[PDB]
Amino acid sequence: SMRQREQQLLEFLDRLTSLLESKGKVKTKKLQSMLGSLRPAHLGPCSDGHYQSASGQKVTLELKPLSTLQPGVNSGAVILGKVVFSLTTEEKVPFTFGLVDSDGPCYAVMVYNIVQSWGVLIGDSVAIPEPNLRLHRIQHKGKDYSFSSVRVETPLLLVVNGKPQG
Numbered sequence: 001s002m003r004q005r006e007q008q009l010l011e012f013l014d015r016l017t018s019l020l021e022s023k024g025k026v027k028t029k030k031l032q033s034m035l036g037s038l039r040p041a042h043l044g045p046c047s048d049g050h051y052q053s054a055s056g057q058k059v060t061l062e063l064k065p066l067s068t069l070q071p072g073v074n075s076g077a078v079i080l081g082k083v084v085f086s087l088t089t090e091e092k093v094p095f096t097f098g099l100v101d102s103d104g105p106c107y108a109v110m111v112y113n114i115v116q117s118w119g120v121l122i123g124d125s126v127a128i129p130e131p132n133l134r135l136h137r138i139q140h141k142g143k144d145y146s147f148s149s150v151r152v153e154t155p156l157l158l159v160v161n162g163k164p165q166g
């Protein structure tokens with residue numbers, strides 16, 4: 001049997017893994033036009049060369065594909081993608097969305113600590129400085145999930161359509 005918290009969490013992972021595989025059921029033509037609309041300018045101030053690192057220092061960031069992210073904190077990198085779906089759990093944590101930055105696979109992004117109003121729309125550009133990639137391998141209650149997520153500490157770190165969120 002399952003209790004309520006675990007049941008809705010497994011439901012969420014079911015939906016998330018399905019949405020990642022279908023890229024939010026967004027049609028190929030729409031995906032290509034979304035991807036075509038990505039601009040270097042959408043990095044916003046991450047581009048600047050005077051981006052203030054979370055550990056204190058002023059560092060320069062390099063745009064890299066999602067597919068090249070390594071587990072853990074990807075120091076000195078930034079990623080830039082298009083939103084193809086969003087969802088959350090019954091507990092409204094985390095705020096989760098899928099990004100594509102290429103013709104290859106979609107990546108989940110999980111955003112924590114949303115205090116004020118926040119969200120993103122399908123078709124938005126999102127830049128994530130120094131992304132923290134987690135490689136989930138979950139086996140629980142006869143279910144099995146294997147997917148990556150980028151853990152975002154606060155929305156304030158993100159750049160959306162080239163506008164810093166903080």
Ligand SMILES: [Cl-]
Pocket residue numbers: 086087088
């Ligand atoms: Cl949502």
